[PDB]
Design a protein around this ligand. Structure first.
Ligand SMILES: CCCn1c(=O)c2c(C)c(C(=O)C3=C(O)CCCC3=O)ccc2n(C)c1=O
Ligand SMILES: CCCn1c(=O)c2c(C)c(C(=O)C3=C(O)CCCC3=O)ccc2n(C)c1=O
Ligand SMILES: [Co+2]
Ligand SMILES: [Co+2]
Lengths: 381, 381
């Protein structure tokens, strides 16, 4: 069921913005680890005396890394005279966010038809405003409302290159890395209580629940009209034997925030070979692999979609597989991206549901909670 | 002239500690960029609920990256019950340092025979104490006094593995990178006034001035008895046409701090090939190269030490060369390590002064200020 109840026209995921203490070092680590190119910048070299912002791209995926400068550099500016390229940026907010949460996502940005319209409708329907709409160079409109914790949902609309005031990167410094990642598939929040959070977000977006198919989580997924913008939310299940990983997140994060970003690859096998090659030389580590029992059990579950060779390939790389009614999902998770056990990344590829491919095809892998436990205990034998 | 006036027995540079917001991402960037191995850790996985600290090694060079956790994780601890592996660490101090300075060096650590003795003598002779001596596991003694700005000089003595409470890195995660860097040659501070700073530091160490051989700097070098611990200090020269790079540092750093770390390599040619290979894929960028006139002028200056082929090699890699009375120095500088134009790294190799090789052999390259200007203007032609 899809009531298609979006309250404003929503296009696609546009970008993700991390708030950090040093944008240079985080951006350079991510570039090498994930194979994303340096595409644009707004820093001192471009006249921005307020914040250092660096943009990484892979296909249509945009990761923006931003950090503050000393406020003394821009102490004489006022908002009408600012040199910031992101008018919503605030020194105090950024330092407070990062000291409270450590490294993580500040903005989930989606492209809309009319950022001004989306903002007003949103707050008309209960959104807590964060940054009012601003028109950049008469060409781009940007606005922000609260999503959960200190994460904002950013609207971005274009009348007709990333943002005004950003310069393209002189390719000499812009090495064309590419491990196969292509777009952002979904962005997941952790909250203490799922009910009030879902009611708030679906309330002002009109997004509908996507509908799915003991391990410490309850969760639900909001979706836009064509189900291409996907925003799942988790809450802790307390009192179980094994401590909830959602509760651990809220503890070490100082409350709600974004849990994982799921990046779609055009060839998950090559993405995972390339990332694993780099895990120990500046890249990302992956969660411990499932036991061979898990892969011996895959023939019965997806032996009609993946060849026996394609299953052995999953086993070498530690990929997980799940399946709903309409298609199949290959997935794998990184260890946390930073010091704290909080944000992590998921790499995914979806098989099926062709009309183009419809969003959510195969679900989100909840069936791998039980299957992982099962295969672990079979292998304990 | 060497009066050998050290007021306590001083051995060698022991380590450098960076204070950052996310130790994981900075450490991983440095590892790949400089070819340093992950050697030890003290974090949540080792029972440290206070700070995440990761140690990188290359030969005898030790880079320690440290970041705070949420104070709520250790809110019930007191100093007698602390889980920190570095007793001098303080949450407030670390967050205040990094928000004020961005990424940079907090501690310059030297190994002494008696850290307790060195501390008392130092403050007896004018050192401002920072952290009193603490004995770790009855095996290591650590103490800290102020050096300049918010940089401390850390004393470390061993009765007889980095520090108690640090675990060796399970080599699976400890890839053995090595680009040829071997030890820390010198560590350089920027201050507004050189006179008062030198008087303070030589005052409590007994270190002597090392003695050298318009571009915006005045500087002097303090040295220990065998001249192996080397601590140069710069001050701005104001009112010149081209703005002083020392003044720019103090502006963007919010005052005094460490300017550069000079790492000695056993083969600067291979170190620079390896680092340059990585500049655009997560490593470090190097300052713009000198013009061909500079290298055509090298035959007359060091044609008795470097072959014509060894000079062409310098030209490919952008290495600079200087020479004093006793030996020759090859050097090159990175662009800043972070967002702000503040800290940078120097790679160096020294030729000459054999007895082992005496420290400071060839000076520090001040003769390259004029030679760079000269060759630039000849090449303007
Ligand atoms: C330490 C790794 C633990 N772990 C996960 O974290 C994990 C995640 C995070 C997902 C996931 O992506 C997801 C959604 O996107 C929608 C909300 C529900 C949900 O969980 C799916 C499976 C997972 N499995 C199997 C697992 O074992
Ligand atoms: C943007 C690069 C600008 N630049 C330097 O920064 C530079 C430095 C930093 C050194 C140096 O190491 C040093 C000492 O170690 C002792 C104190 C004096 C001193 O300066 C030497 C030469 C340099 N030259 C030539 C240069 O052009
Ligand atoms: Co997911
Ligand atoms: Co130097």
């Amino acid at each position: 069921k899809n009531p298609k109840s979006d309250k404003f026209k929503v296009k696609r995921f546009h970008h993700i913005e991390f708030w950090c203490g040093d944008a240079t070092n985080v951006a350079r680590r991510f570039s090498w680890g994930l194979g994303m190119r340096f595409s644009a910048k707004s820093d001192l070299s471009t006249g921005n005396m307020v914040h250092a912002s660096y943009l990484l791209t892979s296909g249509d995926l945009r990761f923006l890394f931003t950090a503050p400068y000393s406020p003394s550099l821009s102490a004489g500016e006022i908002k009408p005279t600012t040199t910031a390229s992101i008018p919503s940026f605030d020194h105090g907010s950024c330092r407070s966010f990062f000291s409270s949460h450590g490294l993580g996502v500040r903005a989930v940005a989606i492209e809309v038809e009319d950022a001004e319209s989306a903002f007003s409708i949103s707050v008309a329907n209960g959104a807590i405003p964060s940054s009012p709409p601003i028109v950049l160079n008469e060409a781009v409109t940007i606005a922000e409302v609260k999503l959960y914790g200190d994460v904002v949902l950013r609207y971005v609309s274009y009348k007709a290159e990333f943002l005004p005031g950003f310069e393209r990167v002189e390719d000499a410094s812009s090495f064309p890395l590419d491990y196969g990642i292509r777009r952002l598939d979904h962005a997941v929040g952790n909250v203490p209580e799922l009910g009030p959070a879902l009611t708030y977000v679906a309330g002002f977006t009109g997004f509908h629940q996507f509908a799915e198919f003991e391990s410490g989580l309850n969760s639900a997924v909001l979706a836009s009209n064509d189900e291409m913008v996907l925003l799942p939310i988790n809450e802790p299940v307390h009192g179980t034997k094994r401590k909830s990983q959602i509760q651990t997140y809220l503890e070490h994060n100082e409350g709600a925030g974004l849990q994982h970003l799921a990046l779609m690859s055009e060839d998950i096998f090559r993405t995972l070979r390339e990332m694993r090659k780099r895990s120990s030389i500046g890249g990302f580590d992956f969660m411990p692999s499932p036991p061979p029992t898990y892969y011996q059990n895959l023939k019965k579950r997806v032996g009609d979609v993946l060849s026996d060779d394609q299953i052995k390939e999953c086993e070498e790389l530690g990929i997980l597989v799940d399946r709903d009614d309409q298609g199949t999902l290959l997935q794998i998770f990184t260890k946390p991206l930073g010091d704290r056990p909080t944000i992590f990344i998921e790499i995914i590829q979806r098989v099926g549901c062709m009309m183009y491919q419809s969003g959510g095809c195969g679900g989100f892998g909840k069936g791998n909670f039980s299957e992982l436990f099962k295969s672990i205990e079979e292998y304990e034998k």
